[PDB]
Design a binder for this molecule. Structure first.
Ligand SMILES: Nc1ncnc2c1ncn2[C@@H]1O[C@H](COP(=O)(O)OP(=O)(O)O)[C@@H](O)[C@H]1O
Ligand SMILES: Nc1ncnc2c1ncn2[C@@H]1O[C@H](COP(=O)(O)OP(=O)(O)O)[C@@H](O)[C@H]1O
Ligand SMILES: O=C(O)c1sc2cc(Cl)ccc2c1Cl
Ligand SMILES: O=C(O)c1sc2cc(Cl)ccc2c1Cl
Ligand SMILES: [K+]
Ligand SMILES: [K+]
Ligand SMILES: [Mg+2]
Ligand SMILES: [Mg+2]
Lengths: 308, 308
């Protein structure tokens, strides 16, 4: 089973030798990908790269490269176990990176000449980071013995169930802010189950659901106690999984339409939900498409390729 | 009120002088547009242009140019009235032109080197023809005194009502072929009324409805007596009119997706419905977009700009 330019190992050897193979693989893969991202930071427009917060993330990436390269060759389970400590630390050290980049770039990007430069930098940086985090988490998860998982790969993911999980989460945030939340109905292939990697859905779904719920409440300020449902349709075929999220939140206005996919743009939480979700979907071989019915609502279509 | 590179006059003079102005306008506009299309025929790949049916349409276009240019200057109501006879004849003489081109091109296009050449020829020819027919019909309709119309412009078009008209039509064709037809529900801005030109909708709507109904029946061969509804949503805003037509007919397969917009392509009536509808929508400043949920259904979105 694989993803773009990387593979997620589904080993299961008794002596635990698959952990050594996995670890050695990480050590030959992660430093290269970190190095590529450091180059990304090096080539940022000077005035952006000088931003203290951007510099901090840059330094963090240098540190990560240094720590991995300083780690001795993995020869035994004792080494592998310490390697896992390093991986856990880095995952934790880097958990706020998306937020730091958003902040650092927010002001600094208003300065430079080329406007698609930041978009390209963020698309490339955030997707490479997702890949890095997936590989690292997969390696850790190989030690686990949860049913239905091989590392971070779920062998029988139910899209309805993971959708429901994020629905409950988004409904709670929405209720806290507006005193109510749209109900969500789910239809189509509600009983589908198939091998799949949850992690990208764990980012994308709450972003799209928050969007749809905010849009619904903000357009029904007179009747917060009675708002139209959000309707989610699951289509599962041999090629891809499609999740359509349809709201009656009034639509994306014509004057806003060409901006909603830009990092930082927002009508309101830092305006990253849509461009990030799209970059993730595309990184994984899928896509994220919007259909705006101005005056009525929006349909968002998430497509993710099935596992090979 | 206007459309691309042409205007539809909303005159109403008592002496009937607006009919003379309209007629003179046609005589200074139509011959030019016919001449442009004749050039189109002249530049067709030799082997296609030699097809007897293509030659017939070519000749028909030459004849139309010849008749209009042979018609004397319009100076009085007596002239204008005879001019209307000529216009009616030509409209009638040319009513099968789309069908003739489809047939003539069907075989001949398999020969030539450039594959997007025919697509371009048909997009340009069919849209210029729609423009010609709109102008000509508008001029004729100026003699009429129907309530709510100025020529072919409806001053208070109800999208729900025109949708319902074509729904009944498509349901009857479908019922005759399959012994039943999906019901259609219409929601969103069901009470919208606004100035609008019906003619393009009169072509596009039945094409999209036939598609959705065929797809629905062909995927429910076991239960023809109980098939899922087609659902149409109307969104009316200050910029455009959006009509979403959503079916549970199983979707457009991945292997077919990149072909359904090509003239001539069909899984079955001559495979012109979709590319023609899209060319018309775009000619008028709108668009036609498809979202396929393979295994479930298809959403088709027709957008047409409001009148200026
Ligand atoms: N379902 C929706 N309905 C209406 N507007 C939306 C919807 N989803 C996104 N938007 C618009 O696109 C903008 C960008 O969204 P996003 O990238 O998620 O950033 P944020 O939600 O933080 O503003 C939103 O501020 C909102 O104006
Ligand atoms: N709503 C739909 N659902 C499934 N397939 C569709 C739908 N609309 C169009 N298609 C597919 O696209 C093809 C092209 O349609 P069209 O251009 O209207 O030509 P025709 O209907 O004559 O085949 C159809 O044959 C059908 O396979
Ligand atoms: O930026 C990030 O989120 C992460 S997590 C992470 C984990 C490892 Cl083991 C190495 C680099 C790295 C980076 Cl860079
Ligand atoms: O091709 C067609 O449909 C038509 S209708 C029509 C009507 C007039 Cl008056 C002139 C040309 C012309 C053509 Cl070309
Ligand atoms: K945004
Ligand atoms: K076609
Ligand atoms: Mg958001
Ligand atoms: Mg058709």
């Amino acid at each position: 089973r694989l993803t773009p330019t990387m593979m997620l190992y589904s080993g299961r050897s008794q002596d635990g030798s698959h952990l050594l193979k996995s670890g050695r693989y990480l050590q030959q893969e992660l430093p290269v990908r970190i190095a590529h991202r450091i180059k990304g930071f090096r080539s940022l427009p000077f005035i952006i790269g000088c931003n203290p917060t951007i510099l901090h993330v840059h330094e963090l990436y240098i540190r990560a490269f240094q720590k991995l390269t300083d780690f001795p060759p993995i020869k035994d389970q004792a080494d592998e176990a310490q390697y896992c400590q390093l991986v856990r630390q880095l995952l934790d050290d880097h958990k706020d990176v998306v937020t730091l980049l958003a902040e650092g770039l927010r002001e600094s990007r208003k300065h430079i000449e080329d406007e698609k430069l930041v978009r390209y930098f963020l698309d490339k940086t955030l997707t490479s980071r997702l890949g890095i985090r997936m590989l690292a988490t997969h390696h850790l998860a190989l030690h686990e013995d949860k049913p239905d998982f091989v590392g971070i790969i779920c062998t029988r993911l139910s899209p309805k169930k993971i959708i429901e999980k994020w629905v409950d989460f988004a409904r709670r945030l929405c209720e806290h802010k507006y005193g109510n939340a749209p109900r969500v109905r789910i239809n189509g292939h509600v009983a589908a189950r198939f091998p799949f990697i949850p992690m990208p859905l764990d980012y994308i779904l709450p972003e799209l659901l928050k969007n749809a719920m905010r849009a619904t409440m903000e357009s029904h300020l007179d009747t917060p106690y009675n708002v139209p449902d959000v309707v989610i349709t699951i289509a599962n075929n041999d090629v891809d999984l499609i999740i359509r999220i349809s709201d009656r939140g009034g639509g994306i206005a014509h004057k806003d339409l060409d901006r909603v996919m830009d990092y930082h743009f927002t009508t309101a939480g830092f305006g990253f939900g849509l461009p990030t979700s799209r970059a993730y979907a595309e990184y994984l071989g899928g896509s994220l498409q919007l259909q705006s019915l101005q005056g009525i609502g929006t349909d968002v279509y998430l497509r993710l390729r099935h596992i090979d």
